[PDB]
């Protein structure tokens, strides 16, 4: 779906853009730059890889993008590095970056999805599997499913999977700024409350999509964090996460729970990659590429949504329902 | 196309949302709430209407939405108000709000596009035509087009059109925050420059889509504002705006023009509705519903984008190309 065919004819389009897929341009310009400029994400990968990469170790990377993580493994002295990348253009660009860094003899980039990758494409099973395909929801880009496919077919029992652990969290919040742009009551004496019939209390929406950064606005956490699930990328699979779980939450503050905020932490040994707003205060790129997810809360199913109200010390039961692929979930007060 | 049809079976959807089209839910949840809580925008319409509405005046509104502006006209004592709303479900909701405010005798809502509105649908030609269908780009939702059509067919020579004037502005800006998420150099000694090939220096992108509020980040304006065009809604036509215009811009500061920032001003009598960041520092909801638009600036058409660099006192020539309907435009340094 060429970019130039999606643009009015009176508007100039430079040659470098004309024939590239519009969806690729959109994705790259929304988060790839932010992602590449997340210095702490880059440092996380470098430090974990530094512990495992020796001149004898082969490295397989799922989802090369710019080739940065592949370049890191080679920089660290890896025997060989194979990176796979589903986008034809990104694969070209990753090879250009590789040559620009003089690592052409060390890193091969294959244009294909990791599901199409077969043992004949690698010299031997890799000593290290490397990926960064986490979404705003941790499993939002099907990270576990892709790692699982590769794990079943191409690895060996001694392969190191980076990163090793991930945990997804939820916490109910009061947030006046969010409330202000997701609800209405009226203007002066004019009642407009029937617009509330359409309030979307089902979807998971990324904070970026609201045009809001959580670190930048005032919000109150109304309970301790709720651990929705935990994954070990070397042994878990998506069906280990139950389709429906229940959580009993004790209110530590009084207030209105406007939304559930979702964030996650990924770890390997002592190193941590977190999207908790409290950890990203001075990481603007991370907030722009991952940020956090939100779900507006409705207390019942009346013709109008009902505010979820917390009183400190009371218990509140939430039912968590997952989609079939575990990419989407929903939290409902019971 | 119903909401429930796009959602995983395991996720509960309240009855109020089930059948409503996913496009309606998305638009309402993204912009409508912020819009209705734009208190200055509401005040603007009330104060302008207050100058023209008498017990004798008939009022037609294009784009009823929640019904707010039609309710205002009724509150000021209009003889009759007809509003047209193209969304079927929104039309129903407006009627609900109209009933909740006991104004069923004064306001009627018709479900249809204004282009299908005919004189037989009105008591008589209105003394006042009212609309708020401005986008982030002033003409981004075809405001001039819809008003002109109604102006050709349904009004009378003494009909007051609200609002009367609009002016679209552009100003080159340096913004490090924007630069950090729209460009890449590399990480440490790893060069990633070739990802720059896909930098989207063509599209008009809303600040909100970048996850940024212009008010909340440091940016420098590098010249005086550039007036792209002005409109009088009672006499202007689409073709008043040339398909192409040239602007000679004088650098008032030295710096890198990372982007062109676009904002507008709509006026009627002494009253003003502006999207200039300076004017919306204390209006979060406006910044979320309208905000500003941005276009990243490329100097030439080589394999990689070239920075536009301003030297103070020097002048720079831009070619502005508009789309056929004037909804889209593009600023290119010559």
């Amino acid at each position: 779906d060429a970019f130039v065919n999606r643009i009015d004819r009176n508007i100039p389009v430079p040659a470098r853009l004309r024939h590239t897929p519009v969806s690729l341009i959109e994705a790259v310009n929304d988060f790839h730059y932010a992602m590449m400029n997340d210095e702490e994400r880059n440092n996380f990968y470098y430090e974990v890889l530094k512990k495992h990469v020796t001149p004898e170790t082969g490295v397989l990377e799922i989802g090369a993008g710019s080739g940065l993580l592949s370049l890191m493994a080679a920089k660290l002295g890896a025997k060989w590095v194979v990176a796979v990348e589903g986008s034809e253009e990104l694969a070209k660009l990753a090879r250009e970056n590789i040559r620009a860094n003089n690592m052409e003899h060390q890193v091969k980039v294959l244009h294909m999805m990791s599901t199409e990758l077969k043992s004949k494409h690698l010299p031997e099973p890799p000593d290290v599997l490397l990926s960064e395909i986490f979404g705003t929801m941790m499993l939002g880009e099907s990270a576990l499913d892709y790692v699982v496919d590769v794990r079943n077919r191409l690895l060996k029992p001694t392969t190191k999977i980076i990163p090793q652990f991930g945990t997804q969290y939820a916490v109910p919040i009061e947030c006046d700024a969010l409330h202000r742009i997701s609800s209405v009551s009226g203007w002066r004496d004019l009642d407009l409350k029937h617009m509330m019939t359409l309030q979307d209390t089902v979807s998971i929406v990324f904070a970026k999509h609201y045009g809001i950064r959580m670190n930048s606005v005032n919000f109150r956490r109304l309970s301790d964090p709720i651990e929705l699930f935990r994954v070990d990328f070397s042994s878990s699979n998506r069906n280990d996460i139950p389709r429906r779980k229940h959580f009993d939450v004790v209110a530590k503050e009084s207030g209105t729970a406007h939304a559930m905020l979702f964030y996650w932490k990924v770890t390997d040994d002592e190193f941590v990659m977190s999207t908790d707003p409290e950890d990203t205060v001075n990481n603007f790129p991370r907030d722009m590429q991952w940020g956090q997810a939100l779900q507006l809360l409705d207390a019942s199913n009346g013709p109008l949504p009902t505010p979820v109200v917390f009183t400190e010390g009371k218990n509140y039961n939430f039912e968590c329902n997952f989609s079939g692929d575990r990419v989407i979930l929903h939290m409902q007060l019971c | 196309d119903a909401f429930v049809n796009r959602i995983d079976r395991n996720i509960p959807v309240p009855a109020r949302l089930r059948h409503t089209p996913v496009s309606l839910i998305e638009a309402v949840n993204d912009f409508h709430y912020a819009m209705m809580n734009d208190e200055e925008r509401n005040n603007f319409y009330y104060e302008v209407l207050k100058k023209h509405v008498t017990p004798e005046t008939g009022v037609l509104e294009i784009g009823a939405g929640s019904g707010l502006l039609s309710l205002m006209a009724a509150k000021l004592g209009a003889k009759w108000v007809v509003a047209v709303e193209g969304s079927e479900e929104l039309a129903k909701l407006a009627r609900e709000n109209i009933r909740a405010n006991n104004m069923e005798h004064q306001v009627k809502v018709l479900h249809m596009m204004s282009t299908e509105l005919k004189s037989k649908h009105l008591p008589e030609p209105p003394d006042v035509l009212l609309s708020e269908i401005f986008g982030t780009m002033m003409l981004g939702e075809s405001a001039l087009d819809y008003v002109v059509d109604v102006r050709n067919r349904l009004l009378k020579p003494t009909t007051k059109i609200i609002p009367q004037f609009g002016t679209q502005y552009a100003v080159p800006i340096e913004c490090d925050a924007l630069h950090r998420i729209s460009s890449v150099s590399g990480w440490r000694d790893l060069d990633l420059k070739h990802m720059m090939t896909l930098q989207d220096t063509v599209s008009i992108v809303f600040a909100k889509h970048y996850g940024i509020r212009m008010n909340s980040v440091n940016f420098r304006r590098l010249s005086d504002p550039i007036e792209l065009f002005r409109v009088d809604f009672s006499s202007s036509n689409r073709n008043d705006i040339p398909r192409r215009k040239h602007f000679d811009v004088v650098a008032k500061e030295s710096g890198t023009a990372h982007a062109m920032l676009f904002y507008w001003k709509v006026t009627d009598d002494e009253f003003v509705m502006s999207t200039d960041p300076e004017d919306t520092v204390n209006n979060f909801p406006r910044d979320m519903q309208w905000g500003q638009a941005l276009q990243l600036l490329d100097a030439s058409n080589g394999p990689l984008p070239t920075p536009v660099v301003f030297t103070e006192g020097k002048n720079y020539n831009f070619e502005c190309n508009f789309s056929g309907d004037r909804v889209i435009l593009h600023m290119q340094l010559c």
Partner: peptide, 4 residues
């Protein structure tokens, strides 16, 4: 708007 970020990732997923």
């Amino acid at each position: 708007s970020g990732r997923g």
